[model samples]
Target: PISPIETVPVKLKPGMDGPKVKQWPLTEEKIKALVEICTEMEKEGKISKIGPENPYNTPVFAIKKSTKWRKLVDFRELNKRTQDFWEVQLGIPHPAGLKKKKSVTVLDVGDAYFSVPLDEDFRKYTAFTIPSINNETPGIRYQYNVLPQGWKGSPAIFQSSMTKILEPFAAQNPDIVIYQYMDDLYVGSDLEIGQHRTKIEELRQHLLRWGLTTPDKKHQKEPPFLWMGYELHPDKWTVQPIVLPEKDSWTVNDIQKLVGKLNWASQIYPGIKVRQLSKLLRGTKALTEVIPLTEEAELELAENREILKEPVHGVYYDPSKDLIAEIQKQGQGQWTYQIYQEPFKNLKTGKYARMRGAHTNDVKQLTEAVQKITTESIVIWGKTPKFKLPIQKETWETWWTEYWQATWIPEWEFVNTPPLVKLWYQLEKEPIVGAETFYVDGAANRETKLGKAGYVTNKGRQKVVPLTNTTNQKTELQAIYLALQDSGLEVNIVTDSQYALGIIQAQPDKSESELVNQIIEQLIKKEKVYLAWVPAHKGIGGNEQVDKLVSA
Candidate 1:
């Protein structure tokens, strides 16, 4: 609920009686508009009953099979159980097992309202023009004829109404799980004896009579039927597992929306509220607690905020002191008259306020005030952000001469370039072992590469040394171990990661893998090279040769 006048607003709280759904008077015109808009478009369409003809729209078409479809209205806000009832049925949770599955199953069904495309134009109009007479935004302003059944508000309306209609049947058939999220219904069962199918089809017919339709191909026949943003079966029911892509961190906005939704969806989704919203909910106690602020700091911040909110007026110009000096010429008159005091006052008042006409003090004070105003974060008719474009190339060139003489690097010199050591030296030179290099520089076209197998050479033999891991840092560590073993070196001991390096150094033993431990033990038994993170691409001779070989 928004406050009538405030920069920040808060949600409306439930009254003393606890939460109750808010109600608003609906005009006859709006009621007629809802029915007319829904019926005009829904009445004529009899898309094929076959699931394949309109695979994407089939779920919606099937929803039309309900007897209590478009007539159902869902304006309830305080009904938690009712809301959860719908959420459990049709809410599609974030997908899992997608990688392992052969076919994607989308059990999508929704009211006409869900179909409303929140395009940029619609958003702009909604933001600026749509007034909240009640808590709700004015919906369906422009007469919509032939509107699709899946418009934005249709799901809630359809689901709430349909749920009411089927309340008795649902009560009797508790085993025949029927939950709806908006218009999407998840028909859950034990996946036994084709009972789920029978009930689903029967409910489908009920939806048809209501002028709603189920979109095709969106239904899944699997045991765990996912609907209403949750997964449900006989034994287990849980919110769909939400797997985010690999990331270093999440944002406050993302956490707020995702976790907050889960908070409300807990009952239906199960475990989601606990998992996602726990951290957020714990902070609420601290969130409302006020902290003290210093007066000076508060004042400064408030002043700055005001300045940022409003535009400032200013002008930059020196006072005409020289003009005043030049005006000293036509002074001393021959017929000098005595200076008279002109007492200024309001027209109605005869009492003298101040002598203005012959007083130099008034002019001095006025000038001082003007100057003070100009100095204090203000100027008369001034340009705020002074700038000149076309880049002043000549000035830059003049500076460039001085810069070249003194080795000047501009502030943004490395802005577009990669870090020298990381991007150019290491990554570009690092070999992929099995794969060829992505970047090439050879003599044929000024490009060259080098690869190396670190080991001391013997008489007519080059023994290959192994790095940490069995294979390499990448791929399985075994490949490198095998390569070293096949090299036929008299040195049987293989090198490992830091642990292997530590073993050669005979240092601490803190490693996760057993192979690392084994490598350290082996190194303790025999002589081996240590952890050598050699500067591989320092343009040095040894490093160059190794790089070329690796590239080859």
Candidate 2:
């Protein structure tokens, strides 16, 4: 007996007219593919011609497959009417998460969406209009008998049905773990290869009982690795971004596709920031020549590809050697001054998101380099390289200070006031300390959604500042602000957060923009304040003090 599943329920927003899009232009090949598919489906009783009196019609589109055409209906309006579906967490662990597993097998079912039958009454909504094969009639329309592709709720509905099929098998076999991601079923075990085969066969038999059949081409025999866009090396406990062969040049359309591929690659490899390439694809039109790797852009592109090869485990910052090599490659013989230009360029191009605490450190380093300016020192003093002037000590000092204050201070002021008056109020209550180190930290957990900021002064004074409805970054910022208020004059403020450091220095344009503005304003007026990075949980006394307080 065949058990049929109903389509997921859908409700439309009030007063939304049914969406009608102009049919996509069809190629001769596509037209033939469409006719053949429709004819076969009609014969199989999966679809049929709609009555002439039917008023509803939607546009049809073609998705090219390697050997066939995937006919899809433009149900954009109908999809909008449907409420969003909740996504279940997939059972299959990421390849990185499956490091301890010894063996794996994959089984993919054919026509997954078709397996779930559309409810009889709701079937008419899936109807799409098609041109007559002989071009003599006005048009012919057909409705689907089975759940169709491009329906907003199809995947969720199919997944629900498939989950029902797999859960029983999982319960029957306690030793073997089976994971299902929609139609792709993964079977895994700690046992030997032969035992794994037995597990797979058991799952296959269960699938057959549920009327699901795995295509032979889609079945894998306990392969050590798998490539579902990203290459999964279960044995090595790593996943790598899929880097395709680079083309000599790419058009706007080609670049768009390439950018999408890299974006997908970035999911498994978090360190990969392809924002530059993503930015280049924002234009409205396609197939334009105004896109490709710029000479300078290509340099960064090659660097990203190399970075993708590195294993993801425990990787934080780029290697120092790679950083130095990149600086030299771009700087030529005049490395010192040219290095400063990168961050400035990032700011000027609205690429503030890419700029971080490191870039702020670069600016600080440049300030030191400028103070020791020589006639031969390289700098970005003017437009042309040949006409660029060497830096003078006083001239560079004034230029750097005014530039830093002018660039971001105004934007910062618009968001929040510096704790200048607040700092003064705290100072009046305490004895003056010339220059001291202050360590600060923040935490949030289940007991308290809003956390506290913990700080320790050089004189061994420590306190916890309660924060209301705050994140870790917010708590961290508050601690820094309060510390600056308490200590005036030259002070070294220590923190274990790169995020807080970046926010303090106004790096990465928008993350905690308001808090950064406040920090910078406090820096300008309330004594000389410098932020120092301390490794967390490394037994450092100040950090440990703050950590213990926050944990408490």
Candidate 3:
């Protein structure tokens, strides 16, 4: 009794002509793999040779995952004609939502897409041109007679059909919980071993009746198991980290695969996707385009890997707790928000989709982020919720004032820039209340890849240090740090770098750089420290002295 749901004609929007793309070149290995797969599928009646007159011809590409070749049709061009304009977010519910019955089994359908046959009349539209293993042999044209996985509307149709198939089983066995994500399923219960097996066996029989078959490789009949890439347990679920591939340069396909992996990881750890991929993502223009990994990009990637390499995650979700939407910094001057189910214990990423989005100076992108954050939440979560920044009102406003007007947002109140920890200084004129003034400067000799930091308390009381593997900003911070070691003395400190103060002002715990944290820690303990910025090469005497020492 196979389901007829997939046999119906996949609806498409009206368009001029079917897509035709000049096939991209493929490696001999990939060509051989593609030929073998196509031949097998053709024998299985999943696909067949199309007539030479068949006007539709979408390009096909293949990528090797281990030894298996994953063939994908270039539906980007074909999707225009088959454009199914709609949005349905397929999300797996938090396992914490389920009561005490946390024992789980993970299962996935074999040949999930191919199990659903496309109507014969629409098969021509899914045709693809495949390259031959030997260029001397002509390329072949074939059409998928089944619901092609790469087609625009395939996932939605599969999701709908799968949802209906599981509905009745879930209804009848009210004691067992089944979480279906397309072809994947998580069936859990507190039933005894024998009884649980009975339920699982029954579900398998039921799926077989509906023309779906679960693969043994994916069936996890264990307590600690996996469900949609997440490791599940009786009390918690965890996401393990993977070592990123080491590469000097990245091809478009490599980036695509890397992003897919990062996206999965971000689903478990919020805001990570935008943080590491911002620079890399801007380079995805053409399939053949190769992008050299930037220094900043590499550093971020290394940091991302470092964060993940530590240990496992106990990703928690508690419905009884308050759901919090937090404004998080995505990159420099860029903003994004993440929603957390709080007591905030489970440091994890879950799209409590009702809230959370991003903003940027790119006002067009900002509008999209803001609009989605608003409209989606407006539907349920109240219009206004307390939004907090790690930075204070003055600092946040400094970045905010340039592009968007202050009128854009209403609930704006800042917290945690205490006056006790503050440094009072002058920009235009010298401070008269200054006790003993100390001029400190830090500069890097980029040619030699070394730096120096010096402070002049008095002509006779001056100290300087030669430092290695440091930058102007790091050196500047070190100079101020060195000046503060004499905590016994009441002093006013002046530096030529304006950006030096900016780094020091960042919240200690919020700052990732250890030097910044240590600087803030030192600054917090000081009762008589007034810091000021004086431009370099200024005629100021103490500043001039320290500048000479640092250069020497």
Candidate 4:
């Protein structure tokens, strides 16, 4: 008995070779695991033998576990040839049902991928080859009958499958809160095992008719509930990550592995930034290479573990608080805003206040910044987002002067209306937020004449990026720039070049080269950035490092 619902059939991208085989490297251990999964899947009827003309054969790999191996197809090559690519929102769904100190359960579908059937015609495209045991015999060929994992469309297709099963049940229950992320489902309730017990049993019954829902070895169905890397607290309104960090044993072979964990942990550590992991990034060559951690990676890993341990707070929508869109001017002359309620804490000042606000860089949004001093929209449920002017000293004047002198705000300026309020003043001032100094310089190699721009920060992190070919003037400009970018918005920059400072100060509209104009663009984005010159070759410990970084 099957449900009326079915998944979309797989289709190949146009303009691709008929069929191909890409082999995977194998070790004794890898071969053992790979053979286990290939045999198991074939027995399970998930796949069948295929020996056709021009047979397609992608590689297969296995993820080792204590008792089992998880097989995944090398689908990128197959995917590149895919006619349509839809990476469904995989396994990340917001939690719900407003339960604190309540009973909870998480459910997973057993063999979910193998349960769904693919287009009978497209089965050839799903073909893969597994090596014979002991490398004695030639490779054997097989193809999938059901949906395969790692295919771009699988998540979306599976999400569609699960939705068909649960939608009708949800419509009937009306009270039970079920959060389903593709094959994973989370259910929670405040009931004393009465309604919850009854409701969950009904859900199980619905699933058993399909006979798909299952779990891990532990098969934890009850409290202290953990699902999708974060543990759901039955007694609190917080979610905590289950990642206990370490080195070597947890050594990452690919950049994506480390980033992948952090990406999951980001729900808890909302401020996680990958910029600090540059040295670690170099280690990510491929999946097979065992990348050793640089000294920098050890400290970075240690810090991440400590920070990720901090539990996260759940977001709540309060109707009473004023909806404030705290606006900030972006480097690209675009605008960025964060919406929060009134009496909310500003990340900058660490103080709570009711702010209702509303940048552009072209010196265009420069005036647009203050010109539209307050913008309010009475959206549905009457949430009015008031855009407030950003707090910066000189940019504020530039914004007001350009507005007061004339209406300088327009898409195309031949026809425009002037500002009604010619002049206005405010006494609010911002203190210089940056005390940390950075020494930046540029150098050109005499042998190759390759220009390098580099910056050395006060706390000792530096990066020097090389340009194709340029003089010292351009290189010096380059070093100060990316270095400045890596640092915080409120920053102090000390560069050797007096000319570079002048170019930045002038806010070059066009006369300067594209690079100069670009660097100036970053400066104007409402930063209370303090700029000063430090005489070069002073052998000041910081600049000396920068010189080597730039020249070498």
Candidate 5:
């Protein structure tokens, strides 16, 4: 005995003038059940011999939920359950027969599954050792949501198997249909009625021998099969977007489930139908138990209860305006169809969803050096460098006072032109006590043939230093030493130059960087300073402000 199943007409376009797609053919057993259902309805006078409502007071229903006006439909759950996979195999006929012969095409979808994986011996047993089995029943078929037997990664893994089987058939017949996806094989031919059937049967036998089966349903039994995510009908196929069972209407749970699945697939598929359904599924849920004591509470509770009691869903007969509006609203900021530019060139040529920073060829160089510092890695800190430049004469003092002195170093950690009173307080470790150290740094971008020059200063008026022959690296190193000297108290120096840092670490002696060596020696000589290597430009303490000041 077979269960009764309903088949509905597919609405492709408006006005009902378009082509009507037929249902897949069913097996004898299933057809019997369907026939029995029709017979029952006919006997009850609910339907006529054609299996539809009688003409007297007949009301035809829309085959698709979109046609329903008053009641909303939710097909998400059914879509999930009956989401079918298809393989299309198109068979090409010989060129010699091109005039007289026709090309053949066929489609096929697989059976349902119940479990995710199967034991190694399940194939041999094929009977009761299964989840729960009976002699009258065939082996338990795996459901779509769960992984199938034999293939742990069924969807993708079995997909390839289907591809290979269709290859030879396609190659041998030039006019044959093309098959894609794993299971739904399609065949096309110009050989009128008699010849077309022969080739289709051949392909059918070819597939059955290869260990794959076709839909057992009646009308779906022929040429067009379910493949990919869409159901392929004769001339054209209708895709429901979300997976759904045949003839299932829409509901609230269906819509919500679709939203969740779509969100998950958004990572890969982005804005799939499931997500489209999510926006239209919104409704309030009561988070806490209701109290009926006060009028307001009673009203709120009643309101919440009303919300719960409302219909499960509101549906669209054909792309509802509200559904579309809700989808557009929820997906407003979510969609990002970004066309990316190459690292530096500003032409929109690539596909970069998210990118940051100035384009530079040095990204590779930087990545190579910083690769050691990953999300999984931790860094240990040591001393940082600092330096300072002092105002030599009263004339230069103005430059110091106006620009350098009391400089509001926007780029560095410390800012503000310290009050003159604190200048004295900052230096005298005792009476000025508890005084904090400040680190200042400056740079000249020009690289004269001889090189550049820069200087750095500390928070206190006491420590100051300068570097000649300054390149960016040298300026960086000077700033580092200045940071160290700022706190005769005790601190670390940070630098942008790995080379300068390496020398300070004495990893390998750099006699060439004699000035660098001198600064390194001075800090170590004080023994109060720690030579810490810090990452620059990433809001690193001390260094960040230094960068800001330099930029200013």
Candidate 6:
């Protein structure tokens, strides 16, 4: 048996109380199983009996699924108290880049968190009690000696420990690829097949020294590479999510679980359209009864099912010569452009290339007009102007300058304006209430170069703050400031602009920077505020509706 690694004590958030344990109904056989596991664990030094004066004790129960019963503790309360530890950045490698790989080795550390010891002082906080059998005078209460699964910081602690142990090995062997996500260890070599075995041996030894090792059944060599619920194809250079069959019933919890998966899936599985379902999933939380899917939900479920259909891969290519001619004709030496080698598409049917790093050509006063295909990823639809759409020359000039320059305004010279003292005074007149939520967003017009701020609330309500002679940045800042002035004691502000976030954090020297400062000051005096980022145009109802209002 491996010994646990020494780790720091778990710290709870200030002013939060631990959760009290509630009795769970259990059969005699289940009670016996819990006792056995607890006894064995105590014998193995994995757990220790808690004193009568223990400060915290969560409930414990036995879970039975596949022939064996496992003991689990409800650490939800303690988890809530813990702070967010640094998480490992998990990413899927591009398949095209991994195609040349010659060898692959996969391994998973068994009961990984159990190998990392919890600090002695913090062990009592993890205390739990099993229900008394036959109404015994004292229940069997024990606390985990090592980090347990289900604790919020358990993965972070284990990952941090493993990362430290493997860092030296990774540095020594530059050619070999070695990485870990929680308990899963992925070791691979594409340059030299022989290096793969050597790297694996090195990692195995390090893990052994750290009191961690892969189980015999967990070791595998790959032609069929599978890791973490994703199937990797080396020959075709493709990776796809593996779909597991789940129960058909749609409960609030069920929708929540699927929505959580879809949130992560949307990042790696590029083509999967889970946004609509995400918006719909929000409604299920209000449900009182667990039932089958409704008419609209069923349609969304069908769309979700279609998202996992095999992705169609197409060849990467340069833009066709005819397309280039059209771009040159319409662009008229006014806009500078960069070409992408590969186009993103669903297949031959849906095709488009993303635009980036747009630049203006000062020689010609001419400009181009275009619709925002969708701002989710700054993707615009259709190829360069075909010149057949009959876009008016004046319309093209207004759009190209207004939209492009609105995006470009960040590079302009800074202006400092006096803080709006009147708005601040008005804010102080309102009664201090609980936290008020606000969604502040801005949009620029293609026709007039003007923009407006769209302020929205949790309650399906919205208000527009029109901004004159402003860029997108200024408009966004204005929206945030206006909402802050009207907000109650505690506030939650969500926006899609990284620029606004950066400006607020950096306290930059600009006119709107003054507004940002004043708003933040008011928020601090009011009590607390939370600012967060959200992806734009991803079928988020509030943001979409706000965008529509701002543009109008």
Maximum-TM-score candidate? 6
Q: Give the top-scoring candidate (lDDT).
A: 3
TM-score of 1: 0.23
Q: lDDT per residue, candidate 5, 1-552, as tens digits?
A: 111211111221233221112223334444344445444533533222221221111111112224322211122222232223343233322111111124435555564121112223222111111111223442122111222332223454355455556678778877665544444455555567676676676776776664455643353455334444333334333222433232234455543443444343232221222222333443633323221233432343233334333212111111111100100111211221101111221101101111121111111211221222121111111111111112123322333343311422111122122211011101111222233433334455565512222223345233334445556666656665565544555544435567665545432112335555556455544534444445667765555565555645
Off by over 4 Å in 2: 14-33, 61-70, 88-94, 133-139, 217-229, 241-552
Candidate 3 TM-score versus the reference: 0.47
Q: What is the TM-score of each predicted model, taking all chains together? A: 0.23, 0.47, 0.47, 0.49, 0.25, 0.50
Residue 59: error of model 4 in Å?
Answer: 2.6
lDDT of 3 by residue, 144-208 (tens): 87778867767776776787777898888899987767667777787887888778888888888
Lowest lDDT block of 10, candidate 2: 324-333
Off by over 4 Å in 4: 1-5, 22-39, 61-63, 69-72, 90-104, 131-140, 189-193, 216-218, 221-315, 318-552
Candidate 1 segments exceeding 4 Å error: 1-156, 171-175, 215-234, 237-552
Report the C-alpha lDDT of model 6 over 1-552, residue by residue, as the tens digit: 335455765666787666566656578898899988888888877888878998677877788887879987778878887766775554544332232346667777877888788877677778887778666667777888888889888877888778787788878878776757668876767756565666677678778887787745334555556654445543333234535246756666666667666544543344333334444554445654565665655664566567656654422222343221111111212121212223442111111222221222211121222222112112222343222222234433444353324431111111122210011111222323455667789977656768888788876668897676778877887878877777776677778889887655332211223565565566556655566677888887567777777877
Report every candidate's CA lDDT.
0.31, 0.57, 0.64, 0.59, 0.34, 0.57
In candidate 3, which residue pairs clash? none
How high is the lDDT of residue 245 in model 2? 59
Ranking by lDDT: 3, 4, 6, 2, 5, 1
Regions more than 4 Å wrong, model 5: 1-106, 109-168, 180-183, 186-202, 205-218, 221-351, 356-552
Writing each residue's lDDT as its tens digit, candidate 1 over 429-473 gives: 132233211111111112222222342222223233333322323
Name the TM-score of candidate 2. Answer: 0.47
Deviation in angstroms for 349 in model 1?
Answer: 85
In candidate 2, what are the lDDT values of residues 159-231, reduced to their tens digit? 8878777777778778776666766876667788787777777777777765577745344644534545444
